[PDB]
Design a protein around this ligand. Structure first.
Ligand SMILES: Nc1ncnc2c1ncn2[C@@H]1O[C@H](COP(=O)(O)O)[C@@H](O)[C@H]1O
Ligand SMILES: Nc1ncnc2c1ncn2[C@@H]1O[C@H](COP(=O)(O)O)[C@@H](O)[C@H]1O
Lengths: 333, 335
């Protein structure tokens, strides 16, 4: 497994907008996010589409691919981070310079729609990528949560890590819908718990990301093939019960649950239960139909705050019963 | 090497109805009753599925209940046609539990659209029997005059009447995607002069495969999605999405190499499309995704959520002429 170099203070983080033009539509949170990382001691290299607006997206398919490729090809950039998600990252996949990435591996990080690029790069190059902070939603967050997200960010990308790296459960979380551009209030601290939905243990390569986004790359050369023993990691956000039942069944009929040895389900930001008062793992439970797969839910790697940074494509040990996650193989130098 | 085809619909036949997703018979009782009465006055009998009237919020019932409802119709010898009441999100849940052996033992006309695409394509993939992208009971036959009469005409001409081949699918003269007159009629829908669009000139002949594109992403890669083969004609439609969503869906097809295989594309109208302020039409977004690849493309085809609705067989040879805006079915889809 070829690995990216650890982040170091003084390094340059290159940012790009593969989908929504957030640097145009949310300039205050964008500037706040840049300033936050600059103060920590990282430089920011703004991609070529920063500040541009093409309505639902930052620019054309070709322009977006060029923005990302310029960062991949830049030897001065140690980390490539999406500004935010959207719907349209998968449009870039045919045009990405995977050979340039494989020849000099970098840290590739982000979440939600950026899953298309995280998984595509992993599928094409075999280099682990990272489900974690996007610049504007994650680092543009006000105190206190941004500081917890940052701690996880350093733990995975910067710290010399004694293995196994036990991913520690944050004490509090929030999916509260406020304080986007300007801080009007204080976010309620939700006491936190991971859920032991189905007891057991699994070890294998972790694969996954945003499930809604995965259905946009499924079956293509850019979706890594799920293998027997893999641990499936999935999260969704701001969907309703109908939508996630379809996504869960999509996995079911593709025979994914006949393959994976365990499941980690993220919290679901602003979930719409359609009046059923059922939680997402419950809907997943119906789809599974009493197939015993260890299942740990409400994992904090998703649209809720704070956010863990998770390596994708490396061996992991999940213990749903004892509610632990350990990274058992090196994801960086 | 010929194939099993469902028997043609005939007057007095029983149409079994089921709700594979949304509980529309509970939430829209006026349009449900009106749709049923429309088909009854035409001389058809209706067999209500076991989940009729029931309400489980976003769905008609549990996964097992819904598979049971549909399988009861499939295993019933007196049902000649199985029609969904309406779509939703959750038809794909049923796929592992459907009795495909029973269906293939006594093939029926399977018809519906939107979310029901999961089942139409699932059954075709498993049994090789053509299925039909066409009316669902409540949205299609619950429609007030005049449009319901056009939808019925195409339904009949395709499923009941004897048809010589090639069979010309005629362009409706008027259409509407107006969001009104659901339960009660408060005004007349605008009769919009209709046109199919020649987006990219040319002709294609091949097996037509497709349906609701959003729903196809829920069965993709599974045993229930028929494999797209070289030469196929891709038929796709979506409804009530925005530009961002359909770019994702078009790129999904692109990165799966679908456009490297198909000989042509038929794109349905897009009911209540949200262009996100771009003023772009769905086919212009598709064309960007296609980049420098040239593919004959006929758009605004009337087999989708707009009214009236054409009934289209899936899995049979078709000729599309995008230049002259014609579609012909070249192969028997029924007996
Ligand atoms: N106006 C807003 N108010 C509150 N939260 C927002 C707003 N716009 C975007 N967000 C959040 O920003 C994040 C963007 O996620 P994604 O767009 O899927 O990459 C989600 O957590 C959204 O809830
Ligand atoms: N309240 C409503 N008013 C008008 N049209 C509706 C309403 N509810 C549903 N419809 C129509 O019914 C269709 C249902 O299709 P689907 O849910 O996609 O299978 C929608 O796309 C609309 O065209």
């Amino acid at each position: 497994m070829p690995l990216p170099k650890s982040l170091k203070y003084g390094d340059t983080i290159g940012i790009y907008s593969p989908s929504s033009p957030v640097t145009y539509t949310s300039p205050k949170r964008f500037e706040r996010a840049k300033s936050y990382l600059l103060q920590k001691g990282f430089h920011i290299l703004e991609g070529s589409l920063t500040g541009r607006y093409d309505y639902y997206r930052s620019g054309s398919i070709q322009e977006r691919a060029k923005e990302l490729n310029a960062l991949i090809r830049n030897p001065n950039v140690s980390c490539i981070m999406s500004t935010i998600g959207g719907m349209n990252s998968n449009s870039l996949l045919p045009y990405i310079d995977y050979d340039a990435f494989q020849n000099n591996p970098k840290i590739m990080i982000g979440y939600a729609d950026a899953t298309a690029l995280l998984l595509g790069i992993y599928a094409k190059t075999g280099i682990p990528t990272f489900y974690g902070p996007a610049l504007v939603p994650s680092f543009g967050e006000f105190e206190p949560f941004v500081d917890d997200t940052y701690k996880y960010f350093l733990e995975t990308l910067l710290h010399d890590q004694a293995l196994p790296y036990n991913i520690k459960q944050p004490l509090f979380w929030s999916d509260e819908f406020i304080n986007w551009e300007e801080k009007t209030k204080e976010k309620e601290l939700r006491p936190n718990n991971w859920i032991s939905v189905t007891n057991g243990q699994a070890t294998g390569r972790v694969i996954g990301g945003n499930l809604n986004t995965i259905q946009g790359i499924w079956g293509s050369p850019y979706m890594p093939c799920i293998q027997e023993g893999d641990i499936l990691f999935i999260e969704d956000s701001s969907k309703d019960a109908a939508t996630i039942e379809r996504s869960f069944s999509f996995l079911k009929i593709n025979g994914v649950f006949d393959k994976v040895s365990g499941i980690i389900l993220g919290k679901h930001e602003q979930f719409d239960d359609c009046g059923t008062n059922r939680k997402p793992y419950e809907i997943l439970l119906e789809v599974l139909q009493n197939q015993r797969i260890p299942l740990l839910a409400d994992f904090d790697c998703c649209h809720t705050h704070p956010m863990i940074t998770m390596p994708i494509g490396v061996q992991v040990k999940m213990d749903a019963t004892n509610k632990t996650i350990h990274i058992l193989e090196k994801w960086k130098i």
